[PDB]
Amino acid sequence: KGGSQTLILYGLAVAAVFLVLAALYESWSIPLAVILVIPLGLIGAAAG
């Protein structure tokens, strides 16, 4: 049943990635240019 705890997983996931991205790259455009790429791998895994 522990499968509907997922939006907190990806909630923490994209938040951690967005932050570290905004930390290294020192802006907010680049993290948005990357978290935009996360569904591209999702369609690949789902179609697989």
Partner: protein, 48 residues
């Protein structure tokens, strides 16, 4: 270079890929671990 000439249309096909991704994902069945081949099989016997 080609996909950059047509930025808008490529952002459209992107959104299409994303939508298809989320739909293809949520159409998948859900389980814990896949029931896999252990060394044995368990048969139980119940008598009236």
């Amino acid at each position: 270079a080609k996909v950059l000439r047509k930025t808008f249309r490529m952002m459209v096909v992107y959104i299409g890929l994303a939508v298809v991704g989320v739909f293809l994902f949520m159409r998948l069945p859900t389980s814990f671990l896949p029931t896999e081949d252990q060394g044995f099989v368990m048969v139980s016997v119940q008598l009236p």
